[PDB]
Paper text:
XT1 and XT2 are type II transmembrane proteins consisting of a short amino-terminal region facing the cytosol, a single transmembrane helix, a stem region required for Golgi localization (Schön et al., 2006), a catalytic GT-A domain (Lairson et al., 2008, Müller et al., 2006), and a unique C-terminal domain of unknown function, termed “Xylo_C” in the Pfam database (Finn et al., 2008). XT1 has a two-lobed structure, with one lobe comprising the catalytic GT-A domain and the other comprising the Xylo_C domain.
To visualize how the different amino acid substitutions are accommodated in the peptide binding cleft, we selected five variants of the bikunin-derived peptide for structure analysis (peptides 3–7). Three bikunin variants bound identically to the wild-type peptide: peptide 3 (proline at position −3), peptide 5 (alanine at position +1), and peptide 7 (proline at position +3). Proline can be accommodated at positions −3 and +3, where the wild-type peptide naturally adopts a backbone conformation favorable for proline.
Residue numbers in the entry:
A (entry chain B): 210 to 220
B (entry chain A): 252 to 311, 313 to 727, 734 to 959
The structure:
């Protein structure tokens, strides 16, 4: 249901 | 310490060089940066071989499609990439997915030696199970995970005696949500397709969130960010989940092709964060096989980014990452959806919630026979002798030793006689193994296996002791629970230090659990073993808050003994809990010496836990400081050997109970039961995780 991808940005 | 081959001015590279530890790592950081500086490291343009104007997006839905019986069923190569301690859950999942016509190739993280030894026992029993002889340390987000998959694909293609048709990767936290028969029927119908799931958002944002436009290097079990880089021109870059199913024809292409696309992408993704989330999508969509892609990985992933995005890998990678949550029983209905085809799901953890694993396994392959033992229990090894006491800490070594002595004392007092007591023991050596013990998703404590001399017959015996912690939480407000521990898991909302084992140099964390209601404010008070008040603070509990936690900055070392944490509401008592800071009997795995014990067990380096003082609160809260107890605490601080052991075991005995003790072999103690005949021992029967002979239908379950 939710999007895929484990990256959450630089911070 | 030779200088670099080029001037290094990038802010990110200088930061990585200052934080790196080994000379080999600083050198490799320098070489990578300088090669990229000259434009010789990354490709700038790449050939696209796909004849399609864009993406394919082939369609795959009727539930009755999976009920037919194929004449030419596919045979599957499962690649299991695993780490950690949960061998019995991996065995349970392996049982559910096993069929004699498939193949299983298991890579165990280099750092998980216990799990590797358990996996070797499986590979020795079955001819269609093999372990990778090479083993990488596959850190989260590491470049090494793509190296692992690529090498495993080359290995599998060269295994001529294993004629497989599909490639499927799984972790120890995956589980099937449909039967093997249904999986085979579906893949036999679509054997020329590839199953990869794309992110499902704006592609430009996906690139930035993944850090795909940044240069990374894996070294010293860390992913170092070294600067920026350009996306290569001429190709479409895509990505999403790194859990997929790929047919043999495409794996062959990836492994043996020497064309411009595969060559340059293998170089690009050698220096990429989370490479397996993007490399296979990008190659497939730009290759001659682009028209075989189905935008569905046949998985349900339990994303809950309100909880799973806490930048919890900052110590492992120079980036922020997210992780899926563990399923709970209320999620069972999600496995029965028929919108799209799905055959696996993640994540599952038996130390977090096993009930849902049980529901799923029995729904798929039926209940176990009545009277089957251990179905609601779970055992997880957390120390195994072959790995050595230097793999423990001084804290866990000290306390595991004390739990074993607590069990020997139970054995002695459980025999009622007026003659020689044949249940008196003398401890020998170090613990042989330690297990966590759960029952019905409730933590029951530790199981310690250890050796001891039975003194009446003067013979060595091997025993296992069960110790359980005493309840210490004591209460129309909203507060439901309160606990002190370390290694708080913000995603699963629990302490991963399950037993709450703490020593004087640990930094404890206080947690509170709340029910629904109006917003409120409360006061938290930390009290040390001689009634010194260490810290006080207020906290707002908003009407939506479910968990709160905070780690007060307490000067070290902490005074050993039983601490107390109190919660008040405008001076009105609300609840309290206790926790143990244990004195240590070991120093670098050696018996501690007087000079060491005095410096560690006499309270903080300074005379105070914080700059701010709270002596004015002792009378208001009725917490008087007894001069006598303060003197004795200083006396205890100087003790070693026998006196120190008595002090420790006195404290452990007040916070832990020896529930039972059993013998693994023959024993001279008449009241001791055999471990295999108990309900709690790690030697007792556990058929849900036991692997036996292959059945006529080719199954183990
Ligand atoms: Na084998």
């Amino acid at each position: 249901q939710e999007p895929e991808g484990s990256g959450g940005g630089q911070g | 310490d030779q200088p670099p081959k080029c001037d290094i001015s990038g802010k990110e590279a200088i930061s990585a060089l200052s934080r790196a530890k080994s000379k080999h790592c600083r050198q490799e950081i320098g070489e990578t940066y300088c090669r990229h500086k000259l434009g010789l490291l990354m490709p700038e343009k790449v050939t696209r071989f796909c004849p399609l104007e864009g993406k394919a997006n082939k369609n795959v839905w009727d539930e009755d499609s999976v009920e037919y019986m194929p004449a030419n069923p596919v045979r599957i190569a499962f690649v299991l990439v695993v780490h950690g301690r949960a061998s019995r859950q991996l065995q349970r999942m392996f049982k559910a997915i096993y069929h004699k016509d498939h193949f299983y190739y298991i890579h165990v993280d280099k750092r998980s030696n216990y799990l590797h030894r358990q996996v070797l026992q499986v590979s020795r029993q079955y001819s269609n199970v093999r372990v990778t002889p090479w083993r990488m340390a596959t850190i989260w987000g590491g470049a090494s995970l793509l190296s692992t998959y690529l090498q495993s694909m080359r290995d599998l293609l060269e295994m001529t005696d294993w004629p497989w048709d599909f490639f499927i990767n799984l972790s120890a936290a995956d589980y099937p949500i449909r039967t093997n028969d249904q999986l085979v029927a579906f893949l036999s119908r679509y054997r020329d397709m590839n199953f990869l799931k794309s992110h499902g958002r704006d592609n430009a944002r996906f690139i930035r969130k993944q850090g795909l436009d940044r240069l990374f290097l894996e070294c010293d079990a860390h992913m170092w960010r070294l600067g920026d880089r350009r996306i290569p021109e001429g190709i479409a870059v895509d990505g999403g989940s790194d859990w997929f199913l790929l047919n043999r024809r495409f794996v062959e292409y990836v492994t043996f092709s020497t064309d411009d696309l595969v060559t340059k992408m293998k170089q690009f993704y050698s220096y990429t964060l989370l490479p397996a989330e993007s490399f296979f999508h990008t190659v497939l969509e730009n290759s001659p096989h682009c028209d075989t892609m189905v935008d569905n990985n046949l998985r349900i992933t339990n994303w809950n980014r309100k909880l799973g995005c806490k930048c919890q890998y900052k110590h492992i990678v120079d980036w922020c990452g997210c992780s899926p949550n563990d399923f709970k029983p209320q999620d069972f209905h999600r496995f029965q959806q028929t919108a799209r085809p799905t055959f696996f799901a993640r994540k599952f953890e038996a130390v977090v919630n096993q009930e849902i694993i049980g529901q799923l396994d029995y729904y798929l392959y039926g209940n176990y026979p009545a009277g089957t033992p251990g179905l609601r229990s779970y055992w997880e090894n957390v120390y195994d002798e072959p790995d050595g006491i230097h793999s423990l800490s001084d804290v866990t070594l000290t306390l595991y030793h004390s739990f074993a002595r607590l069990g020997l004392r139970r054995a002695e007092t459980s025999l009622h006689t007026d003659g020689e007591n044949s249940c008196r023991y003398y401890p020998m050596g170090h613990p042989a193994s330690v297990h966590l013990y759960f029952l019905a998703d409730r933590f029951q404590g530790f199981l310690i296996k250890h050796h001891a001399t039975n003194l009446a017959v003067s013979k060595l015996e091997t025993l296992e002791t069960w110790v359980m912690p005493k309840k210490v939480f004591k209460i129309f407000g909203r507060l439901q629970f309160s606990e002190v521990g370390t290694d708080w898991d913000a995603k699963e909302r629990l302490f991963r230090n399950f037993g709450g084992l703490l020593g004087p140099m640990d930094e404890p964390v206080g947690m509170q659990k709340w029910g629904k209601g109006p917003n409120v404010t409360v006061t938290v008070i930390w009290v040390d073993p001689v009634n010194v008040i260490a810290a006080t603070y207020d906290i707002l509990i908003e009407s939506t808050a479910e968990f709160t936690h905070y780690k007060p900055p307490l000067n070290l070392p902490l005074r050993p003994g039983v601490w107390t944490v109190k919660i008040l509401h405008h001076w009105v008592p609300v609840a309290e809990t206790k926790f143990l800071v244990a004195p240590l009997t070991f120093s670098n795995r050696q018996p501690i010496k007087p000079e060491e014990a005095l410096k560690l067990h006499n309270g903080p380096l300074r005379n105070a836990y914080m700059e701010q003082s709270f002596q004015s609160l002792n009378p208001v809260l009725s917490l008087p400081i007894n001069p006598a107890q303060v003197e004795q605490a200083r006396r205890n601080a100087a003790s070693t050997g026998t006196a120190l052991e008595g002090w420790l075991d006195s404290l452990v005995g007040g916070m832990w109970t020896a529930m039972d003790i059993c013998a693994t072999g023959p024993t001279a103690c008449p009241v001791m039961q055999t471990c295999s005949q108990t309900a709690w021992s790690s030697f007792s029967p556990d058929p849900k995780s036991e692997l036996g002979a292959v059945k006529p239908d080719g199954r183990l379950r």
